Amino acid sequence: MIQGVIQKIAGPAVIAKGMLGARMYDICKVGEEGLVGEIIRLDGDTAFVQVYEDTSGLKVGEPVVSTGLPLAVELGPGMLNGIYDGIQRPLERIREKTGIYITRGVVVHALDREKKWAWTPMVKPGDEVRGGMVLGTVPEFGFTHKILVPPDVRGRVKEVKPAGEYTVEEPVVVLEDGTELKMYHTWPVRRARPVQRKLDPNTPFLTGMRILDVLFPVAMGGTAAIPGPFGSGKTVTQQSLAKWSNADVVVYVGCGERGNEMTDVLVEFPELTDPKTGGPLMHRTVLIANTSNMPVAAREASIYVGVTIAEYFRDQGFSVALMADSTSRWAEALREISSRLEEMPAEEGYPPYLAARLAAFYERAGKVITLGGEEGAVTIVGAVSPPGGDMSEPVTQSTLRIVGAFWRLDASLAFRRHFPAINWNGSYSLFTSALDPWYRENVAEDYPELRDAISELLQREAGLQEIVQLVGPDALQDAERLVIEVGRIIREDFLQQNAYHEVDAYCSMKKAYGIMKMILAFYKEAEAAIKRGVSIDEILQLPVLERIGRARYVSEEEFPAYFEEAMKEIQGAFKALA
Amino acid sequence: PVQRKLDPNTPFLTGMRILDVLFPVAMGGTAAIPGPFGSGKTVTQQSLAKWSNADVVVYVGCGERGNEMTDVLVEFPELTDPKTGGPLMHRTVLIANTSNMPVAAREASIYVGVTIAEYFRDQGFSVALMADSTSRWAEALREISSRLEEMPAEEGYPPYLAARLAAFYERAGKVITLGGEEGAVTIVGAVSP
Amino acid sequence: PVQRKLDPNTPFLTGMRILDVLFPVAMGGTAAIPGPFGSGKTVTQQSLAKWSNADVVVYVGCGERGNEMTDVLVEFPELTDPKTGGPLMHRTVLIANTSNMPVAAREASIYVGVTIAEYFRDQGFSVALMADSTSRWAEALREISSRLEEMPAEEGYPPYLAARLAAFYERAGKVITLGGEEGAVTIVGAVSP
Amino acid sequence: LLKKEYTGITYISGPLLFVENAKDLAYGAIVDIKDGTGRVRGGQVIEVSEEYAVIQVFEETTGLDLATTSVSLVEDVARLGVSKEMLGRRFNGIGKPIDGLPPITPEKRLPITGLPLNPVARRKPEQFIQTGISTIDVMNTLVRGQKLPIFSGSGLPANEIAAQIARQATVRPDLSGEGEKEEPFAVVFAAMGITQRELSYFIQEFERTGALSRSVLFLNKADDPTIERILTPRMALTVAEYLAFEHDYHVLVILTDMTNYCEALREIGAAREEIPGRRGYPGYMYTDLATIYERAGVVEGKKGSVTQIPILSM
Amino acid sequence: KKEYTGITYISGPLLFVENAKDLAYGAIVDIKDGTGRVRGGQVIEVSEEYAVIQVFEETTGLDLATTSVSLVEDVARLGVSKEMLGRRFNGIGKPIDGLPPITPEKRLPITGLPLNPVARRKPEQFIQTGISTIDVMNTLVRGQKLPIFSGSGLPANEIAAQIARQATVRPDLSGEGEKEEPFAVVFAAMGITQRELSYFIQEFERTGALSRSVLFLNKADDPTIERILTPRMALTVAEYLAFEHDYHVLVILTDMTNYCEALREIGAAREEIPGRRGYPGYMYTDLATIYERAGVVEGKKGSVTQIPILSMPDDDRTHPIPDLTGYITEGQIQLSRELHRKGIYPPIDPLPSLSRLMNNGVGKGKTREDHKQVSDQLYSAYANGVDIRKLVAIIGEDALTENDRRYLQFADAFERFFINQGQQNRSIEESLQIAWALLSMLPQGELKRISKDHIGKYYGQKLEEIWGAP
Amino acid sequence: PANEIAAQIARQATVRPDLSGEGEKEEPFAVVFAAMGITQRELSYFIQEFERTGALSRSVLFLNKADDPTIERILTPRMALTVAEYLAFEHDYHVLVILTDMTNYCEALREIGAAREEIPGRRGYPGYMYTDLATIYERAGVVEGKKGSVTQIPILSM
Amino acid sequence: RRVNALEQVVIPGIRAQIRFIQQVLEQREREDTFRLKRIKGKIEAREAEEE
Ligand SMILES: Nc1ncnc2c1ncn2[C@@H]1O[C@H](COP(=O)(O)OP(=O)(O)O)[C@@H](O)[C@H]1O
Ligand SMILES: Nc1ncnc2c1ncn2[C@@H]1O[C@H](COP(=O)(O)OP(=O)(O)O)[C@@H](O)[C@H]1O
Ligand SMILES: Nc1ncnc2c1ncn2[C@@H]1O[C@H](COP(=O)(O)OP(=O)(O)O)[C@@H](O)[C@H]1O
Ligand SMILES: [Mg+2]
Ligand SMILES: [Mg+2]
């Protein structure tokens, strides 16, 4: 490859000479120390390379060697149960050979080069193989990892290795033109992986939160955003989605995060268990962790590594969910990189191409038909942290133009310790109508025409706030005092959920449906009793109001008996009323 | 050149009650009409062209819509000159440079219009000059300065912007011509902030 | 050079109730009085020159009007020293550099004044130094920097502006002189934003 | 005809590259850029001189090098091949079909920048259009040859109103006294910066009522190169002008979102280090927008008409 | 040994030396002139033809004929030892107290390596600072970064000195009594004046607090590069003591605003285009390499804790320096101007203050088990009372309800006794006792946040225990 | 109406020897008038106002109209103040100086400053504008041992 | 009446002024950045006048 020498050092900017033939945006190794960087400007015989690490100690005349490839990730067996930084360096294997400090110039491989895998072929000599097809399978924990021919390779199969133990470096399939196919291939993180055809999402993405998958649901293959002020509940909700969701593979991206908070994820997660299979939770997760003191170039490309890995797992027929934590701290690194390149800003210091990059990141989601003919889906949920809790910030304005759902957290509800702090007026979703055919088959026939009744009840309560603020609740007539009480019951027994509780942390769909049925039955019976002529004071004393309050903490398998008992008890109590 | 300039002492009758009564403008004066979009600058200027008592009307469409020029071209031969009885188009000169025409020609159109108005002044007539927008002329100057790599003063405008506007508006007034006859020119300019 | 810096434990009496009571300054302290034009900086500093209890007063007129220097030159010989009984001008040194005098001399006057004030400190006196405007010093530094073609900082000032101001206020304090006596210098500087 | 290649690349940085010996490239020409792997990129000459010519690239400059890259001339001015068979087709906003059907056979090739209409050649708009909406038709009526934008918010249903207008608009000659007779009516729909959900919604809505048989669709997605967003409305206006003023159609052009066009223009202009305007947008926004909006109207002596309904979100 | 005499340009703080390609980037050099004086400098740019050197101090007396430059060290290193405890340094390791220099046990680069995120562990033990509003409601945990936000006239220096003088750990409260815990304090002051220098010296030396502290003092008239290098050396010493001798250290950085303005000056002197409001574009990255060196590491017994201090330029929390600080640190303690003007010290405002990591350090087995509920109840009650205190001025006290009068009296007594502690040193048990004494003013049963066991155990104490013993 | 106020001040100004106790009568003020970028409408008013009060026999006028070149405005205040200083301190006159618009002078200064690419101050004006304005205003006052005096009434639009 | 007047008149009036001042300040900052870019570009060309 192309080799040169250093001509000028000034900060991170290094000018090399003799680099005629070097290509744009390649990865170069600078000096004898082995520091890495990117070529950003070519001029005659010279090249402008920008070094990631600290350049103190470099001398003029040290060699510069170009790798000939842009920023790329290694896709193959062995990515699950792994912890990476923003440029795919395994942190666990760095610690085993370096200690508590990350020394500059350390060299490690993303995929383990000395672990045996159980190869099993699915092709024979003479087969005609197109890009994106399947060569064989490899067992990996609870899954079966499929070896895929890279998207740009086609030909005829010459020879296939027999079954046995092999490493990722062994060429298992050799084509007739001399091409050797191994168990892994590299892909540029800034190139979208091709597909056959995109599809409309039609199945829900179950989150385990009662408000989320009922009032503002997100479809499998959709996008969402969760902005909020400081201490509103972003991180807890993201970790809850990681813990309890029904996606096959979860990719968690911390794109620049507080160190003592990244420690919580790095410590607590190995202790947890898989909701579906009961095994370790980390057997289905890929973790990408960056702290604030990591190199800025690794922080900026962290959300592209994650989406590329998610697209790779999508091409094998899985369903992948991607959690991006604090994309505002990714936009900070983007702004810093733009500032180092001397670019004219737009809005509050951001580069004018911010809305292009945000669009290029969110648009990779969606349910597709893979090149092999299988279905796959990627779901993206990103969290935004505005500097002052204002939604006019440019990142929020650029995000809300392209997301399919929008959950807005409120500081007023967080002050009253109402968790989750989702504002049910400013929020919206666009997947309800498409998800309606799925709900009436798998949950209940009445569900889409039962959720809107509760939405109507919540809307009627909001219109009475101008009167309750003027005159106290005890001066209202019973016809609206009843809906005030029902609104309180809804807000405190259905919408509210405790993520630290043992049984309240997760809620299935049928449990929520039963709670809604109980609430609406109470509303109907109380309205009828008011129409008889009874006073509302005797209604609010009924013990069944505590039974609805205990519906959150009842166990998931104990619930079918409790629901039947409550539905009998409420009719028995309201029949005996005057 | 002229012999002497005179003090304006006769009104410029426009035909609008609020402009003729509350805020009059003389036969040698200058006026500016700023306003946002949809405020009514073009309607006001075309009413001034239709109904004023000036002998010759010069209209300059510096960087405006083409439909306004088409409307003026079509509907004016069907009207009647208030003080002569002939067609209204017989007293009108139009200079049109629409918005999608070349930018550099916006600067020349203002000078062409004011030179024609000065020429008709020297024959003893009273001329009213209407400029549809001077902000477009300012934008043309800004673009030319941007190609010259000059340092801008404020909002990107070249520092000599005020000199050009001061020199343009100073052409107006009531004068004694070199031939001994009397003439006057009024300038009404629209501004689009 | 000095021998040892001391602690501030003696108030600087200015004669104004608000400054002496609510916002006191010690004998070796530093104070800043910013404000817009026509707010009262010059009158306050001249009142401090007239009525304070310092032994020697040094006045630096950096880049201001000459009429105020004439007023000080005329009015002061008729006054009485509050602690000596003689003329008030016998304890005052004036360094004047008006606004129409050359720009580069504005930087030199501040250093000359502070050096003279330090010299009178070494004899065992307490000296009060008043700088009429330190913003003109920064403006002069900006003016010189335009000829040097350097890269400016915020608002066009040279990047080393903050070092000069820090080194100027650092000279104030109560010390033990090299001869064993005790002296002090207090600085009051006006800022014109 | 033969082709010429220039291999004197001297400087690459950002979106620009310099060609040394290219003294015969016309200003504003269209070139194609070939790297060592055979991938071809497009570009436009924005400045020419004796020493070198400046070419900006339509997409990423990743993979280029000075030793092996070569620049070839395509055509002196950008041209689009138009034909009457384009009705019912879909294009990617650059001129290539994305419906899977074979490409069209050009009747004529026309410049996409167009030419200014002579104000003497125009005539007054005088015929109304039934939009099917009570608030528009009665109080803010639409005339053939008018340009009437819709000002929308972030959450307001602008796309639904656009689809309803495209489905339900018609021209009524029986009211005008001309007599009940056929009028050739067509719809040119240009969407730029839309997401996949809105693209699917528009496709399904156009197919549902069978309006696709009389419509030409130019579609541009949010992950596409930003140059295609600049070139998208000019293709639609060229096609509409050709139809209206050669085959006497009554066309209706809908520009789905001009806000994305303005962002794409700000991104392009700031990359060339030019002095910004009111809020970072370039100072020549007014001229650039006037080159698009002013292409509608009616022409004296001809039957066709062009009507524009831009849509933007404040 | 080698000396370069090819000076070609001197202007401001920079000078150019030709044929100096042997100098490494960032190397430290010394400049010698015709009078024999030796100055310091740093290489900021190396090329084939010349190198650029930024000079410490002024350039008076230099000339292009006689000046020569020699090399001192390839990278900036500091000699560290356990004998640094009880010493004062000028910001580049030169002693200023007059004692002989320390012999180095090691020489370490002042720019440290980043910590591996997988080697950290969760902070779970607290520090008793001796201040009620910090220990009870905003508890500081070993390994936390908890800055203090102050203003122009507010006494941040006094609070810093008091925290440095009073801080200790409580091994008896943890487990079965625990064992010996070595403790140390590292103090770094950037851009302070002579008055603050004298105050800090006389405060540390008058009570024996110097025997466990290392002080890095940098004056306002010192060179700016000294101010840049001041906090990194303090962090180097803190990391050495914590992770090679098992010490529990506490680092106090006196003013980060001065550091940011020095960074702005240095960046503008090297012809770099700034970012928002004139500050350098890499300020977020540069601050992150200082804050993130604190923490606690698996398999190690020591810990590093940081308390940065910064002054908001106009009490503006939207300024870049406080805004980017909150992106990296785990909370904030905010000083109040109106509490300062009302004669209350220390003027810590409990409403805007927040500590992210309080829940891990408090609780059963590390402190008393009623900590969290008491803190929450105090927060809620004070937040209720502060608005009644304003409503009274319009509607009059006799028109309020009874509970409103209770809350008003509680909000007065809270500011009177709990916050205004003066120079007193309070243990955690004393602060909890005072907090329970204040809660007894409120009627029993109004304490919705506290469980019944703690109410039955601790309610009913009189306020006279501190009223009659102030 | 700043021009009418200036003309009224110039018409009505007088000292009061009887109140001051000097007892010495005075000759009327000599007026030095400097116009920078003035229009014809204001200039025709000023000329008629000076004609009606008979003050043209004691006046010196420097006129730079709005259609005149811009860069000539740098010289005019200096010429006017040189003549005023000579008359006041060489022939014991009492001179009143009126400068019509300093905004035009500042615009003329900004044009040249932006041509040479100086380091600007606020709103694009050159950084030495304080010094340049100081050399104009500070030419007034009273000199010890001399009878004459210079009084300035600049006019400027905000 | 007073509550409604404060809620619906004064607060948006203050907020619009804040939004205007922020944009003016940002525009001035952008102009300063452009000027600094020109100054740096001019300085770089002066040094390389004779290679
Ligand atoms: N679902 C929930 N259940 C219980 N507590 C919650 C819930 N959501 C948020 N909280 C509380 O709100 C706080 C918000 O903290 P966190 O979400 O980590 O930071 P941020 O909201 O700034 O991302 C947490 O300390 C937690 O105690
Ligand atoms: N005097 C008027 N009488 C009636 N309508 C008017 C009048 N002035 C303006 N308008 C209305 O203003 C609209 C357009 O104003 P216009 O002159 O185009 O303003 P601008 O030129 O600033 O865009 C016209 O449709 C017209 O209905
Ligand atoms: N203590 C005071 N008593 C009376 N008048 C004062 C006092 N302070 C200021 N002034 C008036 O305020 C004006 C401010 O003058 P000066 O201080 O010279 O301006 P600046 O503050 O801009 O330097 C003076 O004309 C003076 O008459
Ligand atoms: Mg108009
Ligand atoms: Mg003054």
Q: Report in angstroms the alpha-carbon separations of E240 from A259, C192, E231, E293, E295.
A: 20, 48, 14, 12, 13
To the question of whether residue A132 is assigned a binding role by annotation, the answer is no
Nearest-CA residue for ligand 1 atom 17 is A233
Q: Pick from B8, B23, B86, B88: which is nearest to B52 by CA? A: B88
Cα of C38 from ligand 3 centre, angstroms: 6
For G36, the closest chain F residue by CA position comes to F119
Question: Which member of E25, E120, E288 has the closest CB to residue A292?
Answer: E288
How far, CA to CA in Å, does B55 sit from each of B47, B61, B117, D287? 15, 20, 11, 35
- Does E386 touch chain A if contact means CB atoms closer than 8 Å? no
- Residue A354 in contact with residue A199, Cβ under 8 Å? no
C-alpha of residue C63 to centroid of ligand 5, in Å:
10
Flag whether residue F126 sits within 8 Å of chain B, measured between CB atoms.
Answer: no
In 10 A of CB D84, how many CB atoms?
12
DSSP state of F118: P
Q: Is the CB of residue E181 less than 8 Å from the CB of residue E245? A: no
Nearest to E288, CA basis, from E265, E256, E315, E264? E256
Residues 6+ positions from A147 with CB-CB distance below 8 Å = A77, A134, A135, A136, A137, A138, A172, A183
How many Cα atoms within 13 Å fall on the side-chain side of residue F76? 30
DSSP state of E112: P
User: Residue for token digits 């002095």?
Assistant: D275
Q: Ligand 2 centre and the CA of B38: distance in Å?
A: 6
E314 touches chain G (CB under 8 A): no
Detail the residues of B annotated as belonging to a binding site for ATP.
35-42
Which chain G residues contact residue A347 at CB under 8 A? 26
B123: its two tokens: 């024959």
Taking the CA of residue G31 and the nearest CA in chain C, the distance in Å comes to 12
| C-alpha of E444 from chain center | 40
Compute the distance between CA of residue E341 and CA of residue C149 in angstroms, rounded to an integer.
48
Given resolution (angstroms): 2.8
d(CA E405, CA E411): 10
* Cβ of A230 less than 6 Å from ligand 1: yes
Q: Any contact of C with A, at least 3 CB pairs below 8 A? A: no
> For residue E380, how far is its CA from the centre of ligand 1 (angstroms)?
18
Please give the angle made by the CA atoms of A538, A543 and A548, to the nearest 5 degrees. Answer: 120
Report the relative pairing of strands D250-255 and D305-313 from DSSP bridges.
parallel
Q: Kindly report the nearest CA distance between residue C59 and chain E, in angstroms.
A: 24
Ligand 1 within 6 A of A233 CB? yes
Report the distance separating Cα A447 and Cα A444, nearest Å. Answer: 5
3-state secondary structure of A199: coil
Secondary structure element (H or E) that encloses residue A297, with its range: helix A296-300
Contact status of C35 with chain G (Cβ, < 8 Å): no
Q: Where is chain G discontinuous (C–N over 2.5 Å), named by the preceding residue?
A: none
Q: Which of D275, D278, D279 is nearest residue G34 as measured by Cβ atoms?
A: D275
Q: Which atom of ligand 1 is nearest to the CA of A497?
A: 1
Does ligand 3 come within 6 angstroms of the Cβ of C40?
A: yes
Pairing verdict, β D128-129 and D250-255: unpaired
Q: In terms of CA atoms, which chain E residue is nearest residue C29?
A: E195
CA distance D6 to C182: 83
The owner of tokens 């010059």 is C42
> How far apart, in whole angstroms, are the C-alpha atoms of residue F87 and residue F29?
11
- What is the phi/psi pair of residue E184, to 5°? -155, 160
Please, which residues 16-35 of chain G have a Cβ atom closer than 8 Å to chain E? 29, 33
- In our burial notation (b when 16+ CB lie closer than 10 A, e otherwise), range A545-565 reads eebbeebbebeeeebeebbee
Q: Which chains touch D (3 or more CB pairs under 8 A)?
A: A, B, G
Return the axis-axis angle of helices A509-532 and A448-463, rounded to nearest 10°.
60
B74 contacts in chain D (CB < 8 Å): 123-124
Within its chain, how far is the Cα of E322 from the centroid? Answer: 14
Whether F119 and C152 lie within 8 Å, measured CB to CB: yes
> Which parts of C are annotated binding residues for ATP?
35-42
> Is the CB of E119 less than 8 angstroms away from the CB of A95?
yes
Q: Does residue C39 have its Cβ closer than 6 Å to ligand 3?
A: yes
CB D125 within 8 A of CB D143: yes
**Which residue type is seen at A560?**
P
Is A232 annotated in some ligand binding site?
yes
Method by which this entry was solved? cryo-EM
- A232 Cβ inside 6 Å of ligand 1: yes
| Interface subset of C 62-81, CB within 8 angstroms of F | 65-67
Strands C173-176 vs C4-5: parallel, antiparallel or unpaired:
antiparallel
Q: Which two tokens stand for residue E243?
A: 């992770």
Please check whether residue C5 is in contact with residue C19, taking contact to mean a CB–CB distance below 8 angstroms.
no
- Spell out the alpha helix ranges (H) of chain C: 17-21, 41-51, 66-75, 105-121, 135-148, 161-169
What percentage of chain A's residues is helix, strand, coil (to nearest 5)? 35, 25, 45
Nearest Cα neighbor of E345 from E155, E148, E128 is: E155
CB D25, CB D45: distance < 8 Å: yes
3-state secondary structure A43-107: ECCEEEEEECCCCCCCCCCCEEEECCCCCEEEECCCCCCEEECCCCCEHHHHHHHHCCECCCCCC
Residues from chain G contacting residue C151 (CB–CB below 8 Å)? 36, 39-40, 43
Closest chain F CA to residue G42? F117
Instruction: Give Cβ neighbours of residue E315 (< 8 Å, ≥ 6 apart).
Output: E151, E337
Nearest CA in chain C to E269: C159
Closest CA to B92 of B124, B123, B66, B116: B116
What is the rounded CA–CA span in Å between residue A399 and residue A362? 9
Residue in chain B lying closest to G36 (CA): B151
Establish if E111 touches chain A: CB-CB under 8 angstroms.
Answer: yes
CA A285 vs CA A162, A247, A322: distances in Å: 31, 10, 10
Distances (CA, A) of A25 to A49, A192, A522: 9, 17, 65
Q: Kindly state if the Cβ of C102 falls inside 6 Å of ligand 3.
A: no
Residues 250-279 of chain E whose Cβ lies under 8 A from any Cβ of chain G: 271, 273-274, 276-277
Cβ of residue C22 closer than 8 Å to a chain E Cβ: no
Distance CA A154, CA A179 (A): 10
The alpha carbon of residue E351 and the mean position of all alpha carbons in its chain are separated, in whole angstroms, by 21
Q: Which atom of ligand 3 is nearest to the CA of C41?
A: 21
Which amino acid appears at position F118 of this protein? E
Q: Is F135 touching B (CB cutoff 8 A)?
A: no
Domain ranges of chain B: 1-193
Can you spell out the DSSP letters for chain D? ----EE--EEEEETTEEEESS--SPPTT-EEEEE-TTS-EEEEEEEEE-SS-EEEEESS--TT--TTT-EEEEEESS-EEEE-GGGTT-EE-SSS-B-SSSPPPPPSEEEESS--PPPTTTB-----EEB-S-HHHHHHS-EETT-B--EEE-SSS-HHHHHHHHHHH-B--TTTTTS-S----EEEEEEEEEE-HHHHHHHHHHHHHTTGGGGEEEEEEETTS-HHHHHHHHHHHHHHHHHHHHHS--EEEEEES-HHHHHHHHHHHHHTT---B-SSSSBTTHHHHHHHHHTT-EEBTT---EEEEEEEEE-
Q: Which helix (H) or strand (E) holds A324?
A: strand A319-325
Determine if the peptide bond prior to A229 is cis (ω within 30°): no
| CA-wise closest residue to E313 among C154, F3, D204 | C154
Subunit contact G33:A347, Cβ cutoff 8 A: no
Query: Computed over its alpha carbons, how large is the radius of gyration of chain G?
Result: 23
Q: Which of G7, G22, G25, G26 to mutate to test the interface with A (most CBs of A within 10 A)?
A: G26
Between helices C135-148 and F129-137, what is the axis angle to 10°? 120
Backbone angles phi, psi at B144, to 5 degrees: -65, -40
Annotation-wise, does A237 bind a ligand?
Answer: no
In 3D, which of A70, A69, A71, A64 has the Cα closest to residue A20?
A64
Please, where are the H alpha helices in A149-233?
212-215
Residue E278 has which token pair?
A: 């004139």
Q: β-strand A185-188 against A72-75: which pairing, if any?
A: antiparallel
G29 and E276: CB-CB below 8 Å? Answer: yes
* Beta-carbon contacts below 8 Å between A and G: 9
Asked whether the beta carbons of residue D122 and residue B99 sit closer than 8 angstroms, the reply is no
Of B65, B69, B142, the CB nearest to D283: B142
CA angle E60, E62, E64 (to 5 degrees): 150
> Per DSSP, what are the bridge partners of residue A324?
A253, A382
Q: Are C109 and C62 in contact (CB under 8 A)?
A: yes
Q: Residue A135, SS3?
A: strand
* CA B86 to centroid of ligand 2, rounded, Å: 27
Pocket lining: C23 vs ligand 3, CB cutoff 6 Å: no
Binding site feature residues of C: 35-42
Cα distance between residue E68 and residue E30, in whole Å: 9
| Angle formed at CA E222 by CA E217 and CA E223, multiple of 5 degrees | 120
Token pair for residue G32?
């300063």
Place of tokens 């009178």: C120
Instruction: Name residue B69's amino acid.
Output: M
E273·G43 Cβ contact <8 A: no
The answer to whether the CB of C150 falls within 8 A of the CB of E12 is: yes
Q: Closest by alpha carbon to F67, among E325, B172, A539?
A: B172
> Mutate which of G3, G31, G36 to disrupt the E interface (most E C-beta within 10 Å)?
G36
* In the block, residue with structure tokens 């079954």: A163
Residues in chain G with CB shorter than 8 Å from the CB of F117 are: 38, 42
Cα A110 from Cα A97, distance rounded (Å) = 15
- Ligand 1 contact, A235 CB (< 6 A): yes
